[PDB]
Ligand binder design. Structure first.
Ligand SMILES: CC(=O)Nc1nnc(S(N)(=O)=O)s1
Ligand SMILES: [Zn+2]
Length: 257
């Protein structure tokens, strides 16, 4: 079973998942001076008004809030995307201290954490089918830095005590993911992959330039979670991020001048 530690972490993943050394792996460093502004790109369309959250879950590598994706309800359109992508889940990656935790980096800068809102392309019918297609997923990535509290995150942190260990879940209905968004929807975009095994190269990445700020107390709660299942030696869920991968033959485009 893969993980983030010395003997099962990111440098080991290629053995069970050889795509780990593929041509479109994520995350990557975003070099702000090399990324080209592309005026053909469109405004992102984030329509989360009808979002229906279901559960919050510790899956052993992060915690995720899941959504009902049986019909168009919370979807992402526009930007670099064709067609409609339904929100299935969001999760975070974070560090043991504030100077690391994000998966993408900006001019080698590491953020305290990174939020991933995962959406799949409706023209493939289900998530399972979408992940086997180069345009099957759109993941919206948002950086977190430490400062002021993020009110829309507080309902999430208040429940983390209840899902401390792997496998634990709780009801998490009536959560509005709009409260996790920054003001500007300016973004970078590039073709990439899932950043956890099986690391499938099925993702259009859309990373927002403006981070959201969260308080030290909020991110502290992230760090109290556990990779392990109940009763096992406590091994803190921290530094669950994959480092930046080779960009290779890819261009990162900017939606803004
Ligand atoms: C079903 C599903 O969402 N699988 C994922 N694997 N990696 C993801 S990430 N870290 O790139 O957002 S999402
Ligand atoms: Zn992720």
């Amino acid at each position: 079973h893969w993980g983030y530690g010395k003997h099962n972490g990111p440098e080991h993943w290629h053995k069970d998942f050889p795509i780990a050394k593929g041509e479109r792996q994520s995350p990557v460093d975003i070099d702000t001076h090399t990324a080209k502004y592309d005026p053909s790109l469109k405004p992102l369309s984030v329509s989360y008004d009808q979002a229906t959250s279901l559960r919050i879950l510790n899956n052993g590598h992060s915690f995720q809030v899941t959504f009902d994706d049986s019909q168009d309800k919370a979807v992402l359109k526009g930007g670099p995307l064709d067609g409609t992508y339904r929100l299935i889940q969001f999760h975070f990656h974070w560090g043991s201290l504030d100077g690391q935790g994000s998966e993408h980096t900006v001019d080698k800068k590491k953020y305290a954490a990174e939020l991933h809102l995962v959406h799949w392309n409706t023209k493939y019918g289900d998530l399972g089918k979408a992940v086997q297609q180069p345009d099957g997923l759109a993941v919206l990535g948002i950086f977190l830095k430490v400062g002021s509290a993020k009110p829309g995150l507080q309902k999430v942190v208040d429940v983390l005590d209840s899902i401390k260990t792997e496998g634990k879940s709780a009801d998490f209905t009536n959560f509005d993911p709009r409260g996790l968004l920054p003001e500007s929807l300016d973004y970078w975009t590039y073709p990439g992959s899932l950043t956890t095994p099986p690391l499938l190269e099925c993702v259009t990445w859309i990373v927002l330039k403006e981070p959201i700020s969260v308080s030290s107390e909020q991110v502290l709660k992230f760090r109290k979670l556990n990779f392990n299942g109940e009763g096992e030696p406590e091994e803190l869920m921290v530094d669950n991020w994959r480092p930046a991968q080779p960009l290779k033959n890819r261009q990162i485009k900017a939606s803004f001048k």
